[PDB]
Amino acid sequence: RSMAEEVSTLMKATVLMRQPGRVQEIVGALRKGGGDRLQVISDFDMTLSRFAYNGKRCPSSYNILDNSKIISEECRKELTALLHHYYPIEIDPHRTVKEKLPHMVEWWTKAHNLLCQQKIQKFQIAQVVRESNAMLREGYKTFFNTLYHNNIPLFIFSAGIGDILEEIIRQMKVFHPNIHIVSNYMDFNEDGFLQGFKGQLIHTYNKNSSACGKTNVILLGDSIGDLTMADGVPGVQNILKIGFLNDKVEERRERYMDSYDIVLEKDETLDVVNGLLQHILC
Ligand SMILES: [Mg+2]
């Protein structure tokens, strides 16, 4: 497609809205509020990255490192053992979020620590991403170019590895300087060897703005948990929440429609988001 074809209105067949009139009010407030007040807060995996390509499942960006040749079989077995231990805690309906926090911190820290026992060098991150079949949603060029041209900050949150995310966007030539990645970044020594992780730890239950005049927000996600990503932004006046519903659609549709203003069901593209951005940014 040309970049001019990377735009769609809200009448697209993938679009669901519980309150279409409220959506129009929100969009109107964002437009009249101006580009100078806007920020975009987005999840990465299966939101900006693509779930399927002409119906064929794409690999998850979360699995790029774990599925690559730069970690040993021993390390892969240990990461699987951590998953089998901690995943039941993550999904336990009898524990509060606060109760899950120390265990998620422990899981993420142990998994990062295992990576630090490998012999990973910085240049290998780009290699493993180059060899992966991970893809960005169709229409990413217009999405990233529009936010960059209009000076709109884009905060991309991910509980995965920041270096992997960053490399995907870099290799697609859209790593523009309005992008601010909030994720788990590796720390490399002067010889380029992985020696630790930097900064705030981002796991599934603290992926929000407490980890980072832009009082108007567009939030993009694909999970129910992603609805909290703007928590911690001070003074938000208007927010539009857009959710991609990629799978388990019968189980999830009603809850997604009650919680997100716009749901995009089985939509491999950013076209509806790009159309809203063009309308909002005039
Ligand atoms: Mg996601």
Numbering used by the authors: -1 to 210, 221 to 290
Please give me the paper's original passages concerning this structure.
To date, these are the first coordinates obtained for human cytosolic nucleotidase IIIB. The second domain mainly consists of a bundle of helices that are responsible for recognizing the ligand. The C-terminal part of the protein (residues 291–300) and one of a loop connecting domains (residues 211–220) were not defined in the electron density map, and thus are most likely disordered. In all three crystal structures, the magnesium ion was octahedrally coordinated by the carboxyl side chains of catalytic moieties of Asp 41 and Asp 230 and the backbone carbonyl of Asp 43 and by three water molecules. The differences between solved structures: the holoenzyme of cN-IIIB • Mg2+, and the enzyme in complex with inhibitors: 5d or 5d’, concern mainly two helices of the CAP domain, which move slightly down and left towards HAD domain by about 3 Å. Ligand-binding triggers substantial changes of Tyr60 and Trp105 sidechain conformations to form a system of aromatic rings that stabilize the complex. Crystals appeared in a few days at 4 °C after mixing protein with 0.1 M MES (pH 6.2) and 22–28% PEG 3350.
